[PDB]
Design a protein around this nucleic acid. Structure first.
Ligand SMILES: [K+]
Lengths: 31, 48, 145, 55, 14, 49, 41, 49, 764
RNA sequence: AGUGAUCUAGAAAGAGAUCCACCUAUCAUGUUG
């Protein structure tokens, strides 16, 4: 995701990065 | 000035100090009290 | 009233100090609650964060008064040092009572453009007191005009 | 807002547009690459140089 | 957060 | 006490920056500062205007 | 709180479980401590 | 400020004199706090109270 | 006694009080060298030379051990809250200042007698294993005496505990039919009853170690049995290597070592591959049960397991092993809550502590029989694995943890660390359910954790304890090279080079690492080299009576008893002993006053002292005085000059000095580790600039134990080879805490520059 | 036993260089006695 954010130029400060991190760490809890 | 008190407390202490002098207010025998206040003019500039 | 109350709280503190050593205790921070904001100096100065260094600060009143001869801009509070005296006044109640005197938040806001903002509640009325265009501009190369 | 265009998340109160047409294809291709990362073993915790090849 | 001088309530209310 | 003057002025000129840099240097190098102070007390007898 | 009598359960299956638990915990500790892009910036 | 107060002490000693200055300050071993005296007889011993 | 100069926080408080006018300069009668380590290099033998507590270092049980228990912390955060709210109510109640206010042949071991003798004849070493209740400990020595091994020297037997050595010697004498002394005897620290005619001698391992310091061939003995040698004490390991060398010297020396099952091969491979023989014992079968899953919170699993037993299991008392005093106290309280909450649905249950710091009178509550119609739960340390036997136990609950000591050699820190037990200790717990009858052991850890995360045998004391006394004794035996002495498990080099550094700076060793004459005289004393050094300097300084008294007090357990319900009397009576200069002179006060009172027990009960530990300090004082009479010395009194006393303790303890830094409290001079004064100290809140300490203990924090005031000039005079006057003073300073700022580096022109550059969008 | 006493108010064109009241920071150590 961080590499994707680099090519797309995603604002790292934006809340979407936080929510997406949780949207993947919940899977890191899943299995 | 002294580190022990702020100027208002200095004035208060001084006033209470005068009031606590023994027989300071008695005038039966014709006694009197004199409070002299003055400035040491040009004290700093006259230092050799 | 500050001096009379100071004589009182500091005599009470002196008595508690002697009992605290008789019991070989330490005085707790909240063993002196209620007196903290009282006395001249304030009782709270006994627990000033830098007291281990301030114990060496001597001639601090005359130093502060003599600042008038070496600095163009001086604090009008030349007569008191918060490190040594503590907070000698607290005006926080004035703001509360002035709001009441003006008729409350409702009456105050009736004088403002608040209703035209469509803002939900007066509670969210957080003025951004730390940013703005003029704050971005003050550092730039600018003429006097 | 319409149920046809999207739906509210409720957890964050945000409204999300549903994916339609090529949007689904991209979302599925996204899943494909993500699986390919786990498949090729590059994974995440491992500081592998080949990772850039699977984004 | 709301400042203390707003949160505090005059004695006559309570 | 020397730092106090600067505690809230956001706009500084070259002279103020020079003083504040010297103070910051004294905080970073207390031993060299003390050595210099004592050397000046012991030997400096001519001073700047 | 549940017990099994000694020898009744297979110990190497429980060791497999403990190995899974270990490597899960250790990988999760990288998940907790890898310096992210924001941290590196 | 230090120099000023020291030269002021000189002037204080000229105004008070050795004897009265000693009564006011008290013995070096046991100095009086401000405005106090070791005894009422010392307080009354001289016109400068 | 010179006044303690006030620290700056105290000067501040007095200044503010005087400023207020509530006190004056009439009321306060006060107000009227930097020591560096020496930068010479060390000696030739150190110039050329300068543990694994668990099977898995980050495995689940070690994480569980480090993480403690949430139940215990939630219980503290109830006790603290309750204590505070009670204090608040008391304070408001006070805030209104209202102005008017033939048996032998039944023991299992007799079935083996003929084997258990021919094996001792035909071999040199024999690694005997024997299950508890076999009779091996009392019978083997008698069987050897029956067989004429006694014809050519004593049959010595070592026990790891004094009370074992005595009770076994008396039992063996009651079976041989004679007194102690004559045919059977014992020899322990402070007591020798051995006679001219003694056949069998029971002693502690430490006594055979000190006899070997006199006679390293150990020629007085025909047969030496090391009993309970599976406990791997420092003395036992030194005896292992001594006895291998003496055995090579002596064909006629027989040796019998008591192994456990799990170190029997370790011991056989060490003692030249000698036979192992296994003796059966009087013990019943124990069903082990294991948790199906890891337990996150061993205290909470243990409390559940108790309640589950009490309800669903049949008659039998429950022994729960716990790591220390305050888990035990907390568990007694929590279980009493839980049982009271279950109420009428459950039968009667009674809850009891046992641990070593407990008074003897209170410990004796635990071996009273349970009332018929009630069940006993005992919450015990490892004290109940070995030292204390409770009769009637039928269930063991084993959470799998114990506190273990490790010496942090370079820092000088005794660390107590909760860590998993070994499989050997787990089996010692298992057996405790089996003494009364066919009991059960509930292990609060999985079977796989038993196999795959617990060490097979416990890490021996020799790899964990401070070795400087061991090194002094071995070098006094002339055992000059510590590797040619083949320890069964060699001590880490970490403990070697620090022990050698200590003995070097004490001047016990020369610059090539040979023992000096001073080290030779120090070896005569049964006490740590720093105490030995202090004592010899007290003979040079003619102050030995007071110093021997303090040394005795320093060698016993804490003499002050602080009952959980009396922490105000037990503090004001303790504070009556406090000497102004600190703990060493405080202990001299305690002892002297317990001597003016006629050594009486009541004096200890009334002043909250441990009479057990004081009469041990009296025994240590007597032993040291007997050694002085052996040399021909006398104990001179200095009439207590407390400078002469403190200088004489600096002579040993100079490496244990610490200085105040006003920012961070005490830092040791030798290594800079920050340390606190323990609240138990006389010097708590009496902060002196330089102190020395007996030791440092890491508990929740590093605390110095037994702190005493010293002058730094004495460091420079006593150890000019270890200290020097200060210097690398290129440290830093910080401004005062400007309360109103939200970034305390924002005053720097550097950070002002960065704020401006950022506000200009300048990237840098 | 409650009377009276009531400034103020905006337009044009120029000018203007900044700093200091201000949210209350003590023991919990395994065993060997
Ligand atoms: K103009």
């Amino acid at each position: 995701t961080e590499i994707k954010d680099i090519i797309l130029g995603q604002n790292i400060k934006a809340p979407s990065v936080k929510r997406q991190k949780m949207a993947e760490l919940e899977a890191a809890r899943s299995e | 000035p002294s580190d022990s008190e702020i100027p208002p407390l200095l004035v208060y202490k001084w006033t209470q100090g005068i009031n606590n002098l023994s027989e300071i207010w008695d005038v039966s025998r014709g006694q009197s009290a004199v409070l002299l206040e003055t400035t040491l003019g040009e004290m700093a500039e006259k230092i050799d | 009233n500050e001096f009379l109350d100071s004589q009182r709280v500091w005599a009470e503190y002196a008595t508690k100090r002697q009992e605290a050593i008789q019991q070989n205790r330490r005085l707790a921070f909240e063993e002196l609650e209620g007196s903290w904001d009282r006395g001249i100096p304030r009782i709270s100065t006994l627990f000033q964060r830098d007291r281990h260094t301030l114990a060496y600060d001597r001639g601090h009143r005359i130093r502060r008064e003599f600042k008038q001869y070496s600095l163009e801009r001086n604090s009008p509070f030349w007569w008191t040092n918060s490190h040594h005296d503590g907070k000698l006044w607290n005006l926080n109640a004035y703001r509360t009572d002035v709001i009441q005197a003006l008729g409350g938040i409702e009456t105050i806001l009736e004088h403002t453009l608040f209703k035209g903002t469509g803002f939900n509640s007066w509670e969210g009325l957080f003025w951004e007191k730390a940013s703005g265009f003029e704050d971005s501009m003050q550092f730039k190369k600018l003429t006097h005009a | 807002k319409t149920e046809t265009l999207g739906a509210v998340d409720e957890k964050s109160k945000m409204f999300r547009r549903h994916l339609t047409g090529e949007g689904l294809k991209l979302n599925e291709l996204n899943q494909f690459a993500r699986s390919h990362a786990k498949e090729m073993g590059i994974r995440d915790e491992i500081e592998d140089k080949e990772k850039v090849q699977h984004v | 957060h709301i400042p203390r001088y707003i949160r505090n309530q005059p004695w006559y209310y309570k | 006490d020397l730092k106090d003057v600067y505690a809230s002025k956001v706009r500084l000129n070259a002279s103020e920056r020079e003083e504040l840099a010297l103070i910051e240097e004294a905080y970073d190098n207390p031993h060299d500062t003390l050595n210099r102070i004592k050397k000046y007390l012991l030997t400096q007898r001519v001073f700047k205007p | 709180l549940k017990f099994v009598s000694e020898g009744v359960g297979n110990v190497e299956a429980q060791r497999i479980r403990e190995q899974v638990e270990q490597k899960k915990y250790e990988a999760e500790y990288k998940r907790k401590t890898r310096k992210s892009l924001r941290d590196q910036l | 400020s230090f120099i000023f107060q020291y030269y002021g002490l000189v002037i204080d000693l000229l105004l008070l004199g050795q004897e009265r200055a000693t009564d006011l300050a008290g013995p070096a071993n046991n100095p009086n706090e401000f405005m106090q005296f070791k005894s009422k007889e010392v307080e009354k011993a001289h016109p400068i109270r | 006694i010179k006044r303690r100069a006030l620290t700056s926080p105290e000067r501040w408080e007095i200044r503010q009080l005087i400023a207020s006018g509530a006190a004056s300069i009439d009321d306060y009668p006060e107000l009227k060298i930097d020591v560096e380590l020496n930068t010479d290099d060390g000696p030739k033998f150190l110039k050329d030379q300068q543990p694994k507590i668990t099977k898995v270092p980050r495995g689940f049980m070690n994480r569980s051990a480090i993480n403690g228990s949430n139940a215990i912390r939630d219980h503290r955060e109830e006790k603290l809250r309750k204590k505070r709210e009670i204090e608040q109510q008391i304070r408001k109640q006070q805030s209104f200042d209202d102005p008017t206010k033939a048996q032998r042949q039944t023991l299992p071991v007799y079935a083996m007698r003929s084997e258990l003798i021919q094996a001792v004849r035909d071999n040199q070493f024999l690694v005997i294993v024997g299950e508890t209740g076999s009779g091996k400990t009392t019978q083997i020595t008698q069987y050897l005496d029956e067989e004429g091994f006694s014809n050519y020297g004593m049959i010595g037997c070592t026990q790891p505990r004094r009370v074992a050595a005595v009770s076994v010697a008396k039992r063996v004498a009651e079976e041989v039919g004679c007194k102690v002394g004559h045919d059977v005897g014992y020899t322990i620290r402070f007591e020798d009853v051995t006679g001219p005619d003694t056949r069998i001698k029971y002693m502690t391992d430490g006594m055979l170690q000190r006899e070997a310091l006199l006679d390293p061939e150990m020629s007085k003995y025909s047969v030496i049995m090391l009993d309970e040698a599976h406990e791997r004490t420092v003395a036992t390991d030194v005896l292992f290597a001594l006895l291998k060398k003496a055995a090579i010297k002596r064909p006629e020396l027989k040796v019998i070592v008591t192994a456990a099952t799990l170190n029997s091969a370790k011991f056989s491979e060490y003692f030249l591959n000698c036979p192992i023989i296994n003796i059966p014992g009087k013990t019943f079968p124990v069903e082990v049960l294991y948790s199906q899953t890891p337990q996150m919170d061993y205290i909470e699993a243990a409390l559940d397991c108790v309640i589950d037993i009490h309800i669903n299991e049949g008659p039998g008392d429950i022994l729960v092993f716990l790591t220390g005093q305050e888990e035990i106290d907390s568990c007694c309280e929590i279980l009493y809550d839980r049982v009271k909450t279950l109420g009428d649905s459950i039968g009667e249950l009674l809850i009891l502590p046992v641990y070593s710091a407990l008074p003897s009178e209170i410990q004796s509550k635990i071996f009273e029989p349970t009332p018929k119609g009630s069940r006993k739960v005992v919450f015990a340390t490892n004290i109940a694995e070995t030292s204390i036997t409770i009769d009637g136990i039928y269930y063991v609950v084993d959470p799998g943890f114990a506190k273990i000591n490790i010496y942090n050699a370079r820092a000088g820190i005794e660390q107590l660390i909760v860590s998993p037990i070994s499989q050997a200790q787990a089996n010692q717990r298992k057996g405790r359910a089996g003494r009364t009858g066919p009991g059960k052991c509930y292990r609060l850890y999985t079977e796989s954790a038993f196999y795959n995360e617990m060490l097979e045998n416990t890490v021996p004391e020799i790899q964990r304890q401070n070795l400087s006394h061991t090194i002094l004794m071995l070098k006094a035996m002339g055992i000059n090279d510590l590797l040619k002495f083949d320890f069964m498990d060699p001590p880490p080099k970490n403990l070697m080079l620090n022990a050698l550094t200590e003995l070097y700076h004490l001047q016990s060793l020369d610059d090539e690492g040979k023992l000096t004459n001073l080290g030779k005289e120090m070896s005569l004393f049964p006490m740590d080299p720093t105490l030995s050094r202090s004592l010899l300097s007290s003979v040079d300084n003619q102050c030995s009576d007071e110093i021997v008294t303090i040394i005795s007090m320093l060698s016993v357990q804490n003499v002050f008893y602080r009952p959980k319900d009396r922490q105000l009397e037990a503090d004001s009576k303790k504070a009556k002993f406090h000497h102004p200069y600190g703990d060493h002179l405080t202990l001299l006060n305690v002892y002297t006053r317990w001597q003016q009172a006629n050594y009486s027990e009541q004096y200890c009960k009334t002043n909250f002292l441990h009479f057990r530990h004081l009469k041990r300090a009296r025994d240590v004082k007597s032993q040291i005085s007997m050694i002085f009479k052996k040399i021909g010395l006398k104990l001179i009194s200095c009439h207590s000059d407390p400078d002469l006393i403190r200088k004489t303790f600096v002579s040993g303890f100079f490496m244990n000095a610490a200085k105040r830094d006003s920012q961070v409290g005490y830092k040791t001079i030798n290594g800079g580790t920050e340390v606190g004064i323990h609240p138990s100290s006389s010097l708590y809140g009496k902060e002196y600039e330089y102190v020395m300490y007996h030791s440092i203990v890491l508990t929740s924090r590093e605390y110095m134990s037994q702190v005493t005031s010293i002058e730094p000039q004495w460091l420079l005079e006593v150890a000019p080879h270890f200290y020097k006057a200060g210097s690398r003073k290129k440290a830093k300073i910080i401004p005062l805490h400007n309360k109103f700022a939200k970034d305390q580096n924002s005053w720097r022109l550097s950070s002002i520059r960065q704020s401006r550059e950022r506000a200009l969008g300048i990237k840098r």
